[PDB]
UniProtKB/Swiss-Prot annotation, chain B:
The protein's name: Major capsid protein
Subcellular location: Virion
Family: Belongs to the phi29likevirus major capsid protein family.
Quaternary structure (record): Homohexamer. Homopentamer. The prolate capsid is composed of pentamers and hexamers of the capsid protein.
Domain of life: Viruses
Function: Assembles to form a prolate capsid shell of about 54 nm in length and 45 nm in width, with a T=3, Q=5 symmetry.
Boundaries of the shown chain within the full protein: 1 to 100 of 448
TM stretches of this protein: none
Length: 440, 100, 50, 100, 100, 50
């Protein structure tokens, strides 16, 4: 109806520090002698910080006239997702994403005499698969009363500018939520412990800790960038390589500034890519051990399924209601390089990976399993192999060869276990594989 | 013939560290207050690390319908010889190379 | 059976061929690295003691 | 030719090499590999003409098995791997070496 | 009938040493029938009074606080009618089904 | 939402009459002799109905 405020002051929610007006008035040339010659400085001091709630001000020449508003400015600030460059295309139909990787093979020497009888040998290619699916659905709700808002504005251009500002605010909120989800992905990965952990001391403990951390990060990046590749930087234990321009180091500003200032090598190699890849700056990891994450451009498997906006009209209330629906798949790829630098107390062995995750064998065949142990130290650990199918005659050896009995119908589970705990208090890390039995 | 797997879990070969879902649920603004406002965060946490062995998932609207695969990606990563720039030409005939 | 589109089928076949080539390149790199170790073992290098 | 673990140490702990990064006039081109498998070898400074690698055969042949309904691919690589004693070659050894 | 053929091919090989030809004719097919089509058996021997029982929702998804209605169709070979007993084998306390 | 079903079999609403699967193999001169030469009879009959 009619909302008005009275007895409002220009010092509503401020806290005076030293009364700059009185300081200038009584300054005997100490520091405000520069502001002493200034004229009408008190007027600037009164309303130089902005007015929260304004009131009508009469004209200084004719009191009966009031002062009008000569300019209206709408703040158009856009918020962007820092990790939007890792987004992939869109999937209009379907839910599941299948990723296929093919590994390398061995080498055989040239033997013409041997090749007489084995022309038609069968060699099984090494193929691994990963699956992702849609897991984010959300919407944003806003309401606009254009008929009631027409009073606050005089010019149409400003009216539509305000409406567009509301829409841009909706989009900014969507971008912020997308960034939060992408940040949550890394924390989920670390919690599930699929990262390759590099153990470091506390960077803030001493100066040498910072340079040791920089040395470790540079060495890890150099080893990841090697063209020949390696099998000790991914969770699938598959030989793969990276590019120096495809490497991304996600770290926070508080530690990044410390390293930049206190390390001369990084200070010299500022705004450079060949030194530790591209650098991404965010606000914390929400993890007690995580300090920095070195990932590949292909690590993120983010896709979009729906991005639409729909509007409805309420005529009784005379307003519009806007809904912005966003559906997307947020997932990571285990075939890409990923290293996490942890500055806390980490276990001796992080995980154990069995090379064939899923296999199918006959009732008389054999299968070879390879175990990769991700250990944070330079020591070695002995693995133990076991099978929990239950049927007799199925036996796995210490090397990792499993032989299947001639008659059973039961899914086999193969476990490679590493003991890292102390005496009389074992702590076991187990890698699992699934074996199916063909009817033969 | 017909190879199928049953009673398979999404946590087959992983080792939990701190149970991020429970951490977000019981976080009193310590560090996960950024993830607290996020909606459907549990769904992201369940399958955000990839699924080793997938199973048919029924449609959320009509249960009788299944969900199809909408994209297939083949990882094309090439491995190069670091010292390939030192290779010389080819010799189709002969065996011995003489350097003077 | 595992594929629906020909383009993907031929893509998988080409991936297998590229895997073969990658293995060949890795073996070539290993042989070239072995050359230096053989030279050092035979002691034909000029050694600088540090 | 040097390894990444030592290269990073030198780059970080020596200001001259840190300033002269990604530069050729400072100690030539730099090649990074994973170790030397030698108890004394640390770095090797060689010439482009040091390697005498040549290729004799690079071919691929395919056969078909109709009973099994499959294709079998063979990739044959024949090459000469040798070094030249006329080129400059220095090895930096960080162990106990003989006088001569 | 839902019969389809996936493969129908022939392969030939020759043995130069033995001077003979081997022919392999490969046939791959899918053979199935549709349950959405009418079908009558017309059996003359002794048959049971009730042949089968069909539940209208074969697959269902329900909320933790929800309810679901099921319908039973009994294939009877005689005009006599039979009652239906509903049971649930979930085993969780608090979940039960009515007589309808 | 992620609806999945675990440990399901192809015998939900099936009330088999005489178990053709083993009736074919344990057949000596009966009317079932026609399906003895069929090599893939078991696989066909496993999922023939649907």
């Amino acid at each position: 109806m009619r909302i008005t405020f009275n007895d409002v002051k220009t010092s509503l929610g401020i806290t005076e520090s030293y009364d700059i007006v009185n300081a200038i008035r009584n300054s005997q040339g100490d520091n405000f002698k520069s502001y002493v010659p200034l004229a009408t400085a008190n007027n600037v001091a009164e309303v130089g910080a902005g007015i929260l709630i304004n009131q009508t001000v009469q004209n200084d020449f004719i009191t009966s006239l009031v002062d009008r508003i000569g300019l209206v400015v709408i703040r158009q600030v856009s918020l962007n997702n820092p990790l939007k460059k890792f987004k992939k295309g869109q999937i209009p139909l379907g839910r599941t994403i299948e990723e296929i990787y093919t590994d390398i093979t061995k080498e055989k020497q040239y033997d013409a005499e041997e090749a007489e009888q084995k022309v038609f040998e069968r060699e099984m290619p090494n193929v691994k698969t990963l699956f992702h699916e849609r897991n984010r659905q959300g919407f944003y709700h806003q309401t606009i009363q254009d008929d009631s808002l027409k009073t606050a504005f005089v010019s149409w251009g400003n009216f539509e500018s305000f409406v567009s500002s509301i829409i841009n605010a909706i989009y900014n909120s969507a971008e912020v939520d997308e960034y939060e989800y992408m940040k949550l992905l890394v924390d989920n990965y670390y919690s599930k412990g699929l990262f390759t952990t590099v153990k470091i001391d506390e960077p803030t403990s001493s100066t040498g800790a910072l340079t040791e951390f920089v040395k470790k990060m540079r060495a890890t990046a150099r080893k990841l960038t090697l063209p020949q590749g390696s099998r000790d930087w991914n969770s699938m234990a598959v030989r793969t390589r990276s590019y120096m321009e495809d490497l991304h180091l996600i770290i926070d500003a508080d530690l990044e500034a410390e390293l930049d200032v206190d390390v001369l090598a990084k200070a010299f190699n500022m705004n450079r890519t060949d030194f530790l890849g591209n650098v991404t700056v965010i606000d914390g990891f929400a993890s007690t051990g995580l300090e920095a994450v070195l990932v590949d451009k292909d690590w993120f498997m983010v896709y979009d399924n729906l991005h639409k906006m729909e509007t409805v009209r309420n005529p009784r209330g005379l307003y519009w209601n806007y809904y912005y629906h966003v559906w997307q798949t947020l997932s990571v790829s285990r075939f890409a390089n990923a290293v996490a630098f942890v500055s806390g107390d980490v276990p001796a062995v992080t995980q154990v990976i069995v090379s064939p995750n899923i296999a199918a064998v006959k009732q008389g065949g054999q299968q070879q399993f390879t175990a990769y142990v991700r250990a944070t130290n330079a020591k070695d650990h002995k693995v133990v192999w076991s099978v929990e199918g239950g049927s007799t005659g199925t036996a796995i050896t210490g090397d990792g060869l499993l032989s299947v009995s001639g008659n059973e119908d039961n899914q086999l589970t193969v476990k490679a276990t590493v003991d890292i705990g102390t005496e009389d208090k074992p702590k076991l890390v187990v890698g699992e594989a699934v074996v199916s039995i063909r009817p033969n």
